[PDB]
Amino acid sequence: LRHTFVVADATLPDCPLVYASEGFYAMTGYGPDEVLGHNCRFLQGEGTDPKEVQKIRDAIKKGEACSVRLLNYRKDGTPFWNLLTVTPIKTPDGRVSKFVGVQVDVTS
Ligand SMILES: *[C@@]12=NC3=[C]C([C])=C([C])[C]=C3N([C][C]([O])[C]([O])[C]([O])[C]OP([O])([O])=O)C1=NC(=O)[N]C2=O
Numbered sequence: 001l002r003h004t005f006v007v008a009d010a011t012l013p014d015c016p017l018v019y020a021s022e023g024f025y026a027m028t029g030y031g032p033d034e035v036l037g038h039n040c041r042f043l044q045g046e047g048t049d050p051k052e053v054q055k056i057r058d059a060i061k062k063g064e065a066c067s068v069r070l071l072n073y074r075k076d077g078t079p080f081w082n083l084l085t086v087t088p089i090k091t092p093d094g095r096v097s098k099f100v101g102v103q104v105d106v107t108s
Contacts, residue, residue: 001104006040008099010088014039015060015099027105029075040101043072045079056086063088063096069106081107 004023008015016037025031028043044053052068059066065087072082083104088096 004103006101006103008040008101010096010098018098024103027074027080027103028072034075043070043082045071045073047071047079056084059086060099063090080105 002023004027005021006017006024007019009018016039017035018037020032020035025035028035030042041053048071052070055068056066065085067083067085070082070084071079073079083106085102087100087102089098089100091097
């Protein structure tokens with residue numbers, strides 16, 4: 001459906017974003033000069049459920065996939081509901097090299 005896609009670099013200790021689709025920039029209001037190099041958590045805000053955030057934190061430290069419903073905020077401060085699925089991408093030696101994210105605005 002209508003979705004956006006990013007790639008995070010697991011070879012760096014805090015999974016910075018290294019690629020983002022045109023949709024991600026158009027959806028969030030942020031340019032590449034403010035997204036690339038940074039961890040995705042900047043989209044979070046006051047009403048983001050810390051329990052759900054922690055489901056992602058654990059799934060990333062454990063190298064598993066994960067799906068969560070998060071409240072995110074565009075650059076202009078307005079909120080929206082981000083259905084987010086993170087998938088680990090391993091090398092042949094079983095080590096996680098990248099994390100890929102599909103984000104869907106499910107505000108409906
Ligand atoms: C974010 N999308 C997103 C995409 C990928 C590929 C990854 C790996 C993470 C995200 N996040 C979350 C963020 O990077 C982090 O994993 C979590 O905040 C949990 O860890 P912390 O240390 O912050 O407790 C995404 N977060 C969002 O809020 N919106 C997304 O689109």
